[PDB]
Amino acid sequence: QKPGETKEVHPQLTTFRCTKRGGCKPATNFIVLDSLSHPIHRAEGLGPGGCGDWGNPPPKDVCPDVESCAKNCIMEGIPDYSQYGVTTNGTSLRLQHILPDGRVPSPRVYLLDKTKRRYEMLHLTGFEFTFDVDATKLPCGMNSALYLSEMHPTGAKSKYNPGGAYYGTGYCDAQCFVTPFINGLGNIEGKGSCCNSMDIWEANSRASHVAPHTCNKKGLYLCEGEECAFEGVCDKNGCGWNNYRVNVTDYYGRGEEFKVNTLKPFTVVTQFLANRRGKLEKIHRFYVQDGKVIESFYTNKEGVPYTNMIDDEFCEATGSRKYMELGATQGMGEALTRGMVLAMSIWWDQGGNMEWLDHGEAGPCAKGEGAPSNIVQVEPFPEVTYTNLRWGEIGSTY
Numbered sequence: 001q002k003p004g005e006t007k008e009v010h011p012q013l014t015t016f017r018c019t020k021r022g023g024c025k026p027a028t029n030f031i032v033l034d035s036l037s038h039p040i041h042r043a044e045g046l047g048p049g050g051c052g053d054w055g056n057p058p059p060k061d062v063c064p065d066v067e068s069c070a071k072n073c074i075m076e077g078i079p080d081y082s083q084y085g086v087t088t089n090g091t092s093l094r095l096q097h098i099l100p101d102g103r104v105p106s107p108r109v110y111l112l113d114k115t116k117r118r119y120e121m122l123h124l125t126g127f128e129f130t131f132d133v134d135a136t137k138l139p140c141g142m143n144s145a146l147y148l149s150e151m152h153p154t155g156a157k158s159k160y161n162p163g164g165a166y167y168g169t170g171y172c173d174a175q176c177f178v179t180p181f182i183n184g185l186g187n188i189e190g191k192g193s194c195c196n197s198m199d200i201w202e203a204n205s206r207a208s209h210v211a212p213h214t215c216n217k218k219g220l221y222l223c224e225g226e227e228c229a230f231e232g233v234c235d236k237n238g239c240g241w242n243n244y245r246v247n248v249t250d251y252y253g254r255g256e257e258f259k260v261n262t263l264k265p266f267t268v269v270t271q272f273l274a275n276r277r278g279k280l281e282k283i284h285r286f287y288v289q290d291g292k293v294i295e296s297f298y299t300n301k302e303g304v305p306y307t308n309m310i311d312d313e314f315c316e317a318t319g320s321r322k323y324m325e326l327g328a329t330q331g332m333g334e335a336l337t338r339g340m341v342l343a344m345s346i347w348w349d350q351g352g353n354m355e356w357l358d359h360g361e362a363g364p365c366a367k368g369e370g371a372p373s374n375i376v377q378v379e380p381f382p383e384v385t386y387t388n389l390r391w392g393e394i395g396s397t398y
């Protein structure tokens, strides 16, 4: 959409780059909200209205084609991110799902490089990503996410999309959702926005989930028809890793009875271990809390391969069929090697109550407990803070 007259003022965030040799050294990065989370409105004389709702093509009256859409729909800068529940303090990024005044901004943001015109492209195959988190205000049904998508580095900046990454354009993930704009261009044909994504962290105070999601395309792929569906080009389910799902129930939770105690801050390490040919083999998640390394659990379930890391053997046996079919662990790793964008978000789920994350087979949460109507009766103001985001040499971030 066309950038408007209001200026964009991105939050600055200090992150780190790590080596065994020099340790963690500070870096400047900026934060940007999703393009379609910016105010979008019609050009002067075209009246009231936006330019389409999530899940739809843009309106045919203002967006009969890409060129018209580029002129007729205006995207405004955000001069004050705190209005969207987004703030930074030094190395800390706070995402508020609900504001005191009742607004539910449910922010999703990306990491911009220091120039503010390209996303910071992380290449994590053979490397580790680490961050500190405070999950105390995330009850059942809430999802703090920190994850990677193979978005285009300039947000596919182009003639009709001049805003680019500076305005948060170019979002995609393994779900192939239809958005009214894709790569900053009117989605006239109503395609889905598909790409490989590595869900490093989808979690609340009750459960913690890690999942690669493969697509059989490189980059952002606009899918049509069945390509967007379950047997299509992306892995909607991902290869899910969650202690509760492998019959370990005392690893992560609210209280001293859990190895990771989500009433207190902790550190989340994710290692992307590559084989002798440089291909991704295994994904290893452990934690650190009160200065103690908390090692990954091992699986403990009849019919589930014995392992303490995600790999092809586990994924296959736990029925991650499209993950294997669409390129398996090696395929995830090719994406990561090409370069990925970091996204961080806080959301909830009106349709399904985030049950896949923390209910039944996946956690201690009751039926109904994660509905949005119940969340606000448990924690009125859900929020998460990620701090000291840092990546680099295996063994160097903690």
Ligand SMILES: *[C@@H]1O[C@H](CO)[C@@H](O)[C@H](O)[C@H]1NC(C)=O
Pocket (backbone or CB within 6 Å): 247, 300, 301, 302
């Ligand atoms: C779950 O783990 C327990 C040990 O805590 C074991 O007794 C039980 O048989 C396991 N369940 C399955 C189905 O593997």
